[PDB]
Amino acid sequence: SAKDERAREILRGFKLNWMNLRDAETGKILWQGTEDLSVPGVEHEARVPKKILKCKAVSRELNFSSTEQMEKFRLEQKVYFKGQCLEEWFFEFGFVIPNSTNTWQSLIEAASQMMPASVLTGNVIIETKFFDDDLLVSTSRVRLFYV
């Protein structure tokens, strides 16, 4: 369909350039990277400090480029533990200018009692879906290790 084709054009023009995660209370950077963890079809991996699980909230900065215009760029993310969804998060960025580069800041609040890092590590998958409005542009997964 015309929509399948537009989703592929948007994905072809998209890159996640860099990202970081901070403790929202202190501001300190807990994780950073420059690889595009949203590329579909391969399982990505990330190692995060275990103490991130004790944060009341984490702030994310996500820097991305897009050749295509988007009217309502947004994300749906699911935290899966051994295949079961524990939490779902929704975030909206909105309009994206064609051929722009953009930094998107989001706050992720903890929900309700966290299992220990040693039980979670290697058993959490974050599934990220990027949309333009109701159009699914890509689905990607990162497996998390807590260190």
Ligand SMILES: c1ccc([C@@H]2Nc3ccccc3-c3nc4ccccc4n32)nc1
């Ligand atoms: C390190 C850790 C988790 C991710 C994961 N995976 C992601 C992949 C593409 C874009 C954003 C993320 C991301 N946002 C997160 C917010 C809270 C917890 C995990 C989150 N992710 N990426 C790198």
Ligand SMILES: c1ccc([C@@H]2Nc3ccccc3-c3nc4ccccc4n32)nc1
């Ligand atoms: C604050 C906000 C969200 C979470 C969230 N909450 C989680 C709930 C169940 C399993 C894993 C997580 C989780 N892994 C994370 C890796 C990086 C950042 C946040 C992460 N989480 N933890 C503290």
